[PDB]
Design an enzyme around this catalytic site. Structure first.
Site, mmCIF file in Angstrom:
data_model
loop_
_atom_site.group_PDB
_atom_site.id
_atom_site.type_symbol
_atom_site.label_atom_id
_atom_site.label_comp_id
_atom_site.label_asym_id
_atom_site.label_seq_id
_atom_site.Cartn_x
_atom_site.Cartn_y
_atom_site.Cartn_z
ATOM 1 N N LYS A 150 39.314 12.771 60.353
ATOM 2 C CA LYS A 150 38.915 14.186 60.269
ATOM 3 C C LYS A 150 37.767 14.362 61.226
ATOM 4 O O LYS A 150 36.685 13.815 61.100
ATOM 5 C CB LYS A 150 38.390 14.366 58.810
ATOM 6 C CG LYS A 150 37.891 15.832 58.601
ATOM 7 C CD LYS A 150 37.213 15.969 57.198
ATOM 8 C CE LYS A 150 36.638 17.403 57.071
ATOM 9 N NZ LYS A 150 35.884 17.389 55.779
ATOM 10 N N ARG A 181 26.219 17.489 61.333
ATOM 11 C CA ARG A 181 25.506 17.281 60.041
ATOM 12 C C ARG A 181 24.820 15.920 59.997
ATOM 13 O O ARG A 181 23.732 15.789 59.432
ATOM 14 C CB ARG A 181 26.445 17.325 58.856
ATOM 15 C CG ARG A 181 26.941 18.775 58.641
ATOM 16 C CD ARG A 181 27.871 18.751 57.472
ATOM 17 N NE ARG A 181 28.342 20.097 57.020
ATOM 18 C CZ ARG A 181 27.797 20.747 55.972
ATOM 19 N NH1 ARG A 181 26.743 20.224 55.277
ATOM 20 N NH2 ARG A 181 28.384 21.928 55.570
ATOM 21 N N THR A 207 32.342 17.111 51.556
ATOM 22 C CA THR A 207 31.116 17.864 51.850
ATOM 23 C C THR A 207 31.195 19.230 51.167
ATOM 24 O O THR A 207 30.165 19.748 50.625
ATOM 25 C CB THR A 207 31.040 18.076 53.384
ATOM 26 O OG1 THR A 207 30.892 16.778 53.960
ATOM 27 C CG2 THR A 207 29.864 18.991 53.818
ATOM 28 N N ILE A 224 41.679 19.615 57.219
ATOM 29 C CA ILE A 224 40.978 19.462 55.947
ATOM 30 C C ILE A 224 40.031 20.670 55.924
ATOM 31 O O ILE A 224 39.068 20.784 56.734
ATOM 32 C CB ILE A 224 40.265 18.103 55.880
ATOM 33 C CG1 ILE A 224 41.396 17.028 55.760
ATOM 34 C CG2 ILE A 224 39.310 18.041 54.657
ATOM 35 C CD1 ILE A 224 40.900 15.563 55.927
ATOM 36 N N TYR A 231 22.013 10.465 59.054
ATOM 37 C CA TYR A 231 20.562 10.448 59.230
ATOM 38 C C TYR A 231 19.999 9.129 59.828
ATOM 39 O O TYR A 231 19.078 9.162 60.555
ATOM 40 C CB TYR A 231 19.823 10.917 57.943
ATOM 41 C CG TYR A 231 18.613 10.098 57.528
ATOM 42 C CD1 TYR A 231 17.499 10.113 58.298
ATOM 43 C CD2 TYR A 231 18.629 9.298 56.439
ATOM 44 C CE1 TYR A 231 16.388 9.404 57.973
ATOM 45 C CE2 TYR A 231 17.513 8.528 56.113
ATOM 46 C CZ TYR A 231 16.389 8.586 56.893
ATOM 47 O OH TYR A 231 15.209 7.885 56.697
ATOM 48 N N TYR A 237 35.670 10.194 59.006
ATOM 49 C CA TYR A 237 35.215 11.577 59.074
ATOM 50 C C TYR A 237 33.963 11.698 59.946
ATOM 51 O O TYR A 237 32.946 11.180 59.674
ATOM 52 C CB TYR A 237 35.082 12.117 57.635
ATOM 53 C CG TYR A 237 34.316 13.389 57.348
ATOM 54 C CD1 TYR A 237 34.190 14.379 58.274
ATOM 55 C CD2 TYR A 237 33.722 13.565 56.103
ATOM 56 C CE1 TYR A 237 33.491 15.525 57.958
ATOM 57 C CE2 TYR A 237 33.011 14.693 55.792
ATOM 58 C CZ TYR A 237 32.895 15.675 56.716
ATOM 59 O OH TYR A 237 32.184 16.791 56.368
HETATM 60 CL CL LIG Z 1 30.232 18.417 64.026
#
Ligand SMILES: [Cl-]
Ligand SMILES: [Cl-]
Ligand SMILES: [Cl-]
Ligand SMILES: [Cl-]
Ligand SMILES: [Cl-]
Ligand SMILES: [Cl-]
Ligand SMILES: [Mg+2]
Ligand SMILES: [Mg+2]
Ligand SMILES: [Mg+2]
Ligand SMILES: [Mg+2]
Ligand SMILES: [Mg+2]
Lengths: 290, 290
Positions: B160, B137, B43, B202, B106, B132
């Site tokens: 992560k 997000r 990201t 990370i 999304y 992850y």
């Molecule tokens: Cl988060």
């Protein structure tokens, strides 16, 4: 430029390819049922897992089948501004009447970045654009002040505002004073919005109850508040169930049950959990949809 | 399989293309400063606006420059499971030591759909996989119960977990009892995580403070709580500023101030607002990074 009940079409799929046959049938169904416009390759259409080629195929299929009998709005969002311009340009060239453009997802641009994104797209592609704000999926909320700036860009005709928040609808209308149309992007609150200044609803429920959705919208447009709310209450058990798992999982199951499509979902989306089947079949039966 | 300070590399850009020159310099910079592994095209590397070609070019560039002196983890998330399998396979073929795989964004799959997603990827591609989870997000929170199922798939080595919520680290550790490594994905809470069972971080901040991040993590690994917390408190003003606008907007500004890259972001991401420049420059000076 649009009004009323605008269906966010599912993308029928067959063995993980777009099911052109059933997609064409859905265009005819909506024309028959009096839906006011079609959105092709939106969120309900699995835009999030379709490839670039597939989105274009879906848009082209719908436009060709409609044969100018009903307007067609193409979903064309992409995260990078430069990619969104290319996809929106091809949808325009195919003949789409407007582009519905969800904000970037996951990357969380600033309000400045959102203004630059949409103003670059609108300067680059001579097609009407409908903004689409849905922070509950993208983690990006377009604030009303940003909306009002974008309304000064003349090809930006509308915003599909999916938050369901009446004060959000009223702040946009307060700030813009008619300079942008607002479409509800939330079936569960659509009637209140249509009675409070929204022009239409970009609807998941219209995939299944197209006639009733069109009627509810028509009554709101005729300022028949009681009539509009009457149909909204009739739909409300169906509206709720269509989000019991992430859209378009429940709607595809319902449409499956109605014999309109195969009801396939591309992984990582999954067919509706068996635990919800009973409740949804019951609703579909009561509404006489099956 | 990994430990310590693992940098989520920015993707240097010039003329809206990957800046392969400065990307190679960053690989040498991390080798010199003692960073423990490199994540390419995560990201912080603008994965959200890179094309497929660009992602593979960043990953290949990093792998080639590293010359097996430091391990390389490749970001390979895609929303559709079949596309994620293809990217992950390519990364594996290029020699990446593991693939970092964010959840779909999304589209909001169910937990069963997340289990199918990652089990199909793991089945299909013989590479270690680090899950992850970053629901702030993606709007998808992979729950600890689902992580404990995925830990039984032996090429899923790590997660992560970017929430920064201590109870979430605690619940993974409790359900898994060592069956999966947890890496912090939140610099602001990374020391408490490293001191409470996480294997590494990370990190965004490691792009800028690589030597201090590496020593902070070494001290956590040596069971030196005070020494670890001392450096974390030295870094805390920097951690805070690096998220003042969405990552990687501030980090690329700081790296520009340091002469490491050109500091260009692809739209709709925007260079850091001027109002944050003074506070961030004061911090970098205060840490003797400038
Ligand atoms: Cl988060
Ligand atoms: Cl289908
Ligand atoms: Cl929302
Ligand atoms: Cl309502
Ligand atoms: Cl750069
Ligand atoms: Cl901490
Ligand atoms: Mg035209
Ligand atoms: Mg106008
Ligand atoms: Mg290998
Ligand atoms: Mg294991
Ligand atoms: Mg600026």
């Amino acid at each position: 430029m649009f009004s009323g009940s605008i269906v966010a079409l599912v993308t029928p799929m067959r063995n993980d390819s777009v099911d052109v046959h059933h997609l064409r049938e859905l265009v005819e169904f909506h024309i028959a049922k009096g839906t006011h416009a079609l959105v092709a390759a939106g969120t309900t259409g699995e835009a999030g897992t379709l490839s670039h080629s597939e989105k274009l195929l879906v848009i082209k299929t719908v436009i060709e089948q409609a044969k100018e009998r009903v307007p067609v709005i193409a979903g064309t969002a992409m995260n990078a501004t430069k990619d969104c311009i290319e996809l929106t340009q091809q949808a325009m060239e195919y003949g789409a009447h407007a582009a519905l453009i969800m904000t970037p997802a996951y990357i969380k641009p600033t309000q400045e970045g959102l203004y630059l994104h949409y103003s670059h797209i609108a300067q680059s592609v001579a097609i009407p654009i409908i903004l689409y704000n849905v922070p509950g999926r993208t983690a990006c909320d377009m604030l009303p002040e940003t909306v009002a700036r974008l309304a000064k860009i003349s090809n930006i005709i509308g915003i599909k505002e999916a938050t369901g928040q009446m004060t959000r609808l009223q702040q946009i209308l307060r700030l813009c004073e008619g300079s942008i149309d607002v479409y509800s992007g939330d079936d569960l609150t659509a009637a209140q919005w249509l009675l409070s200044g929204a022009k239409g609803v970009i609807s998941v429920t219209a995939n299944v109850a197209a006639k009733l959705m069109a009627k509810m919208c028509d009554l709101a447009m005729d300022d028949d508040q009681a009539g509009c709310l009457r149909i909204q209450e009739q739909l409300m058990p169906l509206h709720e169930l269509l989000f019991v798992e992430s859209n378009p999982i429940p709607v595809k199951w319902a449409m499956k049950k109605m014999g309109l499509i195969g009801g396939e979902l591309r992984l990582p989306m999954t067919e509706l959990s068996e635990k919800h089947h009973q409740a949804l079949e019951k609703v579909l039966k009561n509404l006489e949809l099956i």
